[PDB]
Amino acid sequence: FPQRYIELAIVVDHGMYKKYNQNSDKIKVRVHQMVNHINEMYRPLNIAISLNRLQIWSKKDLITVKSASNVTLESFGNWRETVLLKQQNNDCAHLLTATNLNDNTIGLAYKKGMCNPKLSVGLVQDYSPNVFMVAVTMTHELGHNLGMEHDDKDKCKCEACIMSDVISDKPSKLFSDCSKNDYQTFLTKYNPQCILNA
Ligand SMILES: [Zn+2]
Numbered sequence: 765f766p767q768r769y770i771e772l773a774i775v776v777d778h779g780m781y782k783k784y785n786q787n788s789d790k791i792k793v794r795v796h797q798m799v800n801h802i803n804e805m806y807r808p809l810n811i812a813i814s815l816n817r818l819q820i821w822s823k824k825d826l827i828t829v830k831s832a833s834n835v836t837l838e839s840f841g842n843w844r845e846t847v848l849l850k851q852q853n854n855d856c857a858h859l860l861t862a863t864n865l866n867d868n869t870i871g872l873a874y875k876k877g878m879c880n881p882k883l884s885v886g887l888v889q890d891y892s893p894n895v896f897m898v899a900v901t902m903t904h905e906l907g908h909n910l911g912m913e914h915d916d917k918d919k920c921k922c923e924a925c926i927m928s929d930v931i932s933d934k935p936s937k938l939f940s941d942c943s944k945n946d947y948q949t950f951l952t953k954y955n956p957q958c959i960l961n962a
Pocket of ligand 1: 904
């Protein structure tokens with residue numbers, strides 16, 4: 765895998781702001797540890813994730829965060845294209861929410877959306893006190909932005925690789941051969957030009 769670089773914007777909604785008792789510091793330690801974990805998991809693919817911006821919605825949410833994860837994701841996507849990309853540019857943005865999403869969904873993202881002004885977006889729920897667990901979900905969702913599918917464990921031969929549809933009790937920090945071929949195919953076939961330079 766040739767070197768790639770993602771400028772990632774992470775935005776924390778108001779609900780998560782109140783959960784951590786309005787403490788930005790506490791939010792920031794969580795977010796930097798997460799970025800460290802993500803980079804750790806993306807190292808074998810030669811992708812460098814750089815936290816280009818952390819926006820915490822402390823006054824109020826700038827979009828209505830709804831339990832329906834696909835409706836929230838789409839609202840966020842437009843807000844990125846429409847507002848966020850106008851102030852500071854980034855290759856991808858993920859919303860971290862404390863909101864309980866419908867049907868035990870803890871994360872959602874647009875497949876092959878990397879670099880797109882509307883689609884390079886993702887959503888993950890701060891569902892665990894453990895930063896590593898929330899970081900595995902963010903890595904997984906980032907995996908979909910980069911064209912990765914779930915693992916058909918049967919033929920991918922992995923039980924708890926990053927792309928398993930259900931997050932394991934003890935996720936491994938590894939990508940399956942299947943995920944690597946998908947990412948390889950993403951680069952080859954779509955080649956997002958925004959991730960070429962650092
Ligand atoms: Zn998934």
